[PDB]
């Protein structure tokens, strides 16, 4: 295995990222990040592979006024990959998952960061390509 290394976060609380799955949501408004003990005045921020709590702002009405777990799969902030490459994506994106880790939808549009792929196998299987 091997645990996930530290990456640049980029996505604080309050960031609206795209929704790359076919669940019927168009974006995800991040409201919190899992595993954040936190500090005074510091916003909880998340990178790729991080589980977040998010509410969809637009999309199907049956998903709208609810809090769903989600996993960031693409981030627009450059992050170092322990071998010198600083990778960044065209956009911030995430998928809606449950607390067990399985994805609500069945397809992912676009690449998925390798850090997110090998941390969540169920996202990895549905990933169109790995960045």
């Amino acid at each position: 295995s091997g645990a996930k290394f530290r990456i640049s976060l980029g996505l604080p609380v309050g960031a609206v990222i795209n929704c790359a799955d076919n669940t019927g949501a168009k974006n995800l408004y991040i409201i919190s990040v899992k595993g954040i003990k936190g500090r005074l005045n510091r916003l909880p921020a998340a990178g790729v592979g991080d589980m977040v709590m998010a509410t969809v702002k637009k999309g199907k009405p049956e998903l709208r006024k609810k809090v769903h777990p989600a996993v960031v799969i693409r981030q627009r902030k450059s992050y170092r990959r322990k071998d010198g490459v600083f990778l960044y994506f065209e956009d911030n994106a995430g998928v809606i998952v449950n607390n067990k880790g399985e994805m609500k939808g069945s397809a992912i549009t676009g690449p998925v960061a390798k850090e997110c792929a090998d941390l969540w196998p169920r996202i990895a299987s549905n990933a169109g390509s790995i960045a």
């Binding site: 693409r74 600083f86 990778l87 994506f89 065209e90």
Partner: peptide, 17 residues
């Protein structure tokens, strides 16, 4: 060379450096 430059991953799947 290693340790130099950046890599860009577009949503359409093409990746540049």
């Amino acid at each position: 060379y290693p340790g130099h430059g950046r890599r860009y991953a577009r949503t359409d799947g093409k990746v540049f450096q």
